[PDB]
């Protein structure tokens, strides 16, 4: 029916209208101050005013940083672009790390545009070349007929689609795409056995016009203006199979794309939706990535980048003598606002385990749940969280629904923690 | 050019008078009197254009205004003059050698203005008459505010107009030499005079652009795709000698510009060795280098250096030093930032922000303005009061407080040796 | 060896059903003039007119096996099963018929 993941129970920040956070709402338990700070950040993002703002979710392991990031994404909604990332993802082999970082920057900035689509569809009644020459096609429908003159590219598309008289096609005027949807119903009984799949004759007028709103990113526009991306012509095929790999997009293309987007917004046909770039495990980044991130944040069109780390007084990768608060050099730290994330006591661990069990459709006895909570306190919260599924499997094998203490003990004896395995190694 | 608010949006110039003496607060810049005076000297040198291959080092402590100084220099220099700003981490590419990347950056900052005189007829079309072979007979009529005449077309003009399929009653533009046709809407606008006008169009290009244009059959796409590749040196020599010949002929002028490397402390010894010689030759722009580290080991070398740069390069540069701000300058900079961000701070709120910035950092207090504004908006208050800033301080941590928290709880974070105590118990 | 060795072209031809079923995505943004501008085949390119026309004619005459992939990734049509999914009356009418 449904699958469960690490953050399936996180539905939002659970903040009221005034901004104060309830103890248990939206799947969150505790972490009130961090939830309030993230709510303030969400309000800042919704303001759609500032650019390049950065915050750091600093805390130990298994403390609720990635959950906070996903909650921010949920609170903002699917309209805004939220780009998840890992520090290890920026070490590409086709293009340099700087280009990947810039591409992810522009992928987190959203644009919503309005476009009018001119669409033609009908049964073909004539295929006459004008003589690489234009084709004169006659489209018939249930409401009328129409005769059109198509450019040679559309002629090549029709030629390679094996369109003949009696076929029903679908020409999109804006993009020049031709799709053969099938053979007309009037010829269904012409032969008793042929591969043709028949379709009814289209209803309505041949020339149809609709207005659709589509969401794109600045990276989409950059890719569109940089390399050929589609088409049914051999020219497009050769253009895109030539220079296939990623390229280092220049600043000039980005500036021209920005000018185009400004023109679109000024005409009112487009609206801008700045979003969020989430870079988890930021300590994996090298000093060069941080150094360029310093410059990239100063750009006037940048998203609200959120960073997460779980390291303290660790040396920065690449450097050999720079000890930094979280593996982040002090130059970038001054550009950031740090949201501290605090550990969990026993009661909150117990409630988290209870809710995780409720989400995965498991039944846990109070005493067994207390034992699971105390062993999570003793060893680890995530360890207690992963023990739930083996306990449920063991209970099912004994024809028992609710989890009991004996099943938990058996699961503990089967699967071990890091400390126990290390002790066995010793 | 629509864009959001950056961290340097308020700096609209360098704020100098006629005698190059900077005012206490003008064009968005506050303080840094000697730095701004020296920057004005550099700006005058750039505008004169008679001096080539000068390197200026903008050194000083962090959060002092090095990038702000560069931005002010760029804005006061204005458009119609190249200004290339690249971070030192952008040189390291998998497709271009570091020397080639530096060469391309150097060429990008030298502009060439070429004037093209074109004969174009602009007016409102009235009638078009095209006939079959009797190769082709054609007459077009163009109306303007004070003339209405017919034109006897030829073969190629008829072919071009048929290809464009120009209608009637729409403003059209036809070039006599090139033959290009630019369509315009129906006459908001109207033709303004004689049918055939003589207006020159000026094209601003850089030496790098000419090099890339001549690099391949269709190299000008590489200015956007970025797949230029290491250009042959003979091509660059050809461009240089032709630019010298054009300047002698007077059909093209050169506009020297400024190249800005923000984080020179990341370039390796090979890059500095290349820069040393690249500065000497003609067509070398003015290179501005910003560094902060006092004494560090140059990348690629095992020895310290007076700025992270080899002594050979420092001998070739003049150093502009920036000094840390005091309380009043912090106050006025924060006021300028608040005015740019459209935030109405109170007097006591501004004083608290100033004391926080003096105690911790200017950037930290600058970032707190927007968070404080969002906090106040949650209370349905317009002006940001002291308590909003205090709540922002409580919710968001600075570098020193975060370090203090990490030091006091070093067990719960991952250290350099990779140890952490996830278990809340024991 | 004509059966042990199958080139990529015959694999494209033989896997028509899989390509039809699983090729769904389309580009977010396209620009039609870039298709010809990349190859230098625009009307005002530096390449000579005769060479441009010869290349265009050769492209017209050449055969490509990736045509189906191009047409699937250029335009996306809703699957026919969606009609059943959106009307329970049609769902039961199917089994009745």
């Amino acid at each position: 029916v449904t699958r469960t993941a690490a953050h399936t129970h996180i539905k939002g920040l659970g903040l009221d209208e005034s901004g104060v956070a309830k103890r248990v709402e939206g799947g969150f338990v505790g972490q009130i101050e961090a939830r309030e700070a993230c709510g303030v950040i969400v309000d800042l993002i919704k303001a759609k005013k500032m650019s390049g703002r950065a915050i750091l979710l600093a805390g130990g392991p298994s403390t609720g940083k990635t959950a906070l990031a996903l909650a921010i994404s949920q609170e903002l909604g699917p309209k805004v672009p939220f780009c998840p990332l890992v520090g290890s993802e920026l070490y590409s082999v086709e293009v340099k790390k700087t280009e990947t970082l810039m591409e992810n920057f522009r992928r987190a900035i959203g644009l919503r545009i309005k476009e009018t689509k001119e669409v033609y569809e009908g049964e073909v009644t004539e295929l006459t070349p004008e003589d690489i020459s234009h084709v004169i096609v006659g489209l018939k429908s249930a409401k009328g007929t129409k005769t059109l003159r198509l450019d040679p590219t559309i002629y090549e598309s029709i030629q390679r689609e094996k369109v003949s008289i009696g076929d029903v096609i679908y020409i999109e005027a804006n993009t020049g795409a031709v799709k053969r949807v099938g053979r007309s119903d009037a010829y269904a009984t012409e032969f008793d056995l042929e591969t043709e799949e028949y379709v009814p004759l289209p209803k309505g007028e041949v020339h149809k016009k609709k207005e659709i709103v589509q969401d794109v990113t600045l990276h989409d526009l950059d890719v569109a203006n940089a390399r050929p991306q589609g088409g049914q012509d051999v020219i497009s095929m050769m253009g895109q199979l030539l220079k296939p790999k990623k390229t280092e997009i220049t600043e000039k293309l980005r500036q021209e794309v920005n000018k185009v987007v400004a023109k679109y917004i000024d005409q009112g046909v487009a609206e801008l939706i700045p979003g969020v770039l989430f870079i988890d495990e930021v300590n994996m980044l090298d000093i060069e990535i941080f150094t360029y991130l310093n410059k990239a944040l100063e750009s006037n069109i940048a998203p609200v980048v959120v960073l997460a780390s779980n390291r303290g007084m660790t040396t920065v990768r690449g450097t050999e003598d720079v000890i930094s608060p979280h593996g982040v050099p002090p130059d970038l730290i001054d550009r950031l606002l740090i949201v501290r994330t605090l550990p969990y006591d026993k009661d909150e661990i117990r409630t988290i385990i209870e809710r995780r069990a409720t989400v995965e459709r498991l039944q846990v006895e109070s005493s067994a749940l207390d034992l699971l909570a105390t062993m999570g306190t003793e060893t680890s919260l995530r360890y207690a969280l992963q023990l739930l599924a083996p306990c449920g499997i063991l209970a099912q094998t004994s024809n028992r629904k609710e989890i009991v203490v004996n099943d938990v003990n058996e699961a503990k004896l089967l699967f071990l923690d890091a400390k126990r395995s290390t002790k066995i190694l010793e | 050019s629509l864009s959001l608010i950056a961290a340097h949006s308020h700096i609209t110039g360098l704020g100098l008078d006629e005698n190059l003496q900077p005012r206490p607060t003008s064009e968005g810049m506050v303080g840094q009197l000697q730095a701004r005076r020296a920057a004005g000297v550099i700006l005058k040198m750039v505008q004169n254009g008679t001096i080539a291959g000068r390197a200026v080092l903008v050194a000083g402590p962090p959060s002092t205004g090095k990038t702000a100084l560069a931005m002010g220099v760029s804005q006061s220099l204005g458009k119609d003059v190249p200004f290339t700003a690249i971070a030192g981490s952008e040189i390291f590419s998998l497709e271009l050698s570091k020397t080639e990347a530096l060469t391309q950056a150097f060429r990008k900052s030298i502009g060439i203005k070429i004037k093209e005189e074109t004969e174009l007829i602009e007016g409102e079309v009235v009638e078009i008459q095209i006939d079959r072979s009797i190769h082709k007979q054609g007459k077009l009529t163009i109306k303007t505010t004070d003339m209405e005449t017919i034109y006897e077309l030829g073969n190629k003009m008829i072919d071009g107009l048929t290809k464009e399929k120009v209608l009637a009653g729409d403003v059209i533009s036809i070039d006599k030499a090139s033959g290009k046709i630019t369509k315009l809407g129906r006459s908001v606008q109207c033709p303004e005079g004689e049918l055939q006008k003589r207006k020159t169009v000026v094209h601003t290009v850089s030496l790098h652009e000419i090099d890339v244009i001549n690099s391949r059959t269709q190299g000008f796409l590489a200015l956007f795709t970025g797949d230029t590749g290491e250009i042959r040196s003979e091509v660059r020599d050809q461009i240089n000698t032709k630019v010298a010949e054009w300047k002698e002929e007077g059909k093209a002028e050169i506009v020297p510009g400024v190249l800005f490397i923000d984080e020179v402390h990341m370039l390796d010894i090979e890059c500095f060795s290349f820069i040393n010689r690249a500065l000497e030759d003609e067509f070398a722009p003015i290179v501005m280098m910003a560094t902060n580290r006092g004494v560090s080991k140059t990348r690629g070398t095992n020895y310290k250096s007076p700025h992270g740069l080899p002594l050979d390069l420092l001998d070739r540069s003049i150093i502009i030093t920036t000094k840390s701000y005091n309380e009043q300058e912090i106050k006025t900079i924060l006021s300028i930032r608040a005015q740019e961000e459209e935030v109405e701070l109170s007097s006591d709120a501004l004083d608290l922000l100033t004391k926080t910035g003096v105690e911790t950092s200017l950037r930290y207090s600058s970032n707190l303005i927007s968070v404080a504004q969002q906090i106040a908006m949650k209370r349905k208050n317009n002006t940001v009061e002291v308590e909003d800033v205090k709540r922002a301080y409580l919710l968001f941590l600075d570098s020193a407080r975060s370090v203090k928290y990490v030091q006091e709880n070093e067990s719960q974070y991952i250290d350099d040796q990779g140890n952490v105590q996830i278990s809340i118990a024991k | 060896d004509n059966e042990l060795i199958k080139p990529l072209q015959t694999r494209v031809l033989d896997n028509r059903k899989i390509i039809d079923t699983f090729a769904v995505l389309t580009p977010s943004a396209v620009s039609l003039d870039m298709r010809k501008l990349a190859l230098g085949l625009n009307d005002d390119s530096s390449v000579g007119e005769n060479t441009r026309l010869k290349v265009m004619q050769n492209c017209f005459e050449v055969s490509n096996p990736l045509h189906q992939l191009q047409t699937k990734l250029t335009i996306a049509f809703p699957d026919k099963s969606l009609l059943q999914y959106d009307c329970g009356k049609l769902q039961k009418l199917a089994i009745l018929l």
Binding site: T147, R149, L150, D151, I154 | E127, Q129, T162 | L32, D33
Partner: peptide, 22 residues
């Protein structure tokens, strides 16, 4: 930019004549 699809009437459209007027 350019209209790849054009509407023509069989009786009216012919390449030998091009005409447009107010």
């Amino acid at each position: 930019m350019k209209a790849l699809v054009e509407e023509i009437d069989k009786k009216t459209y012919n390449p030998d004549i091009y005409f447009t007027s107010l």
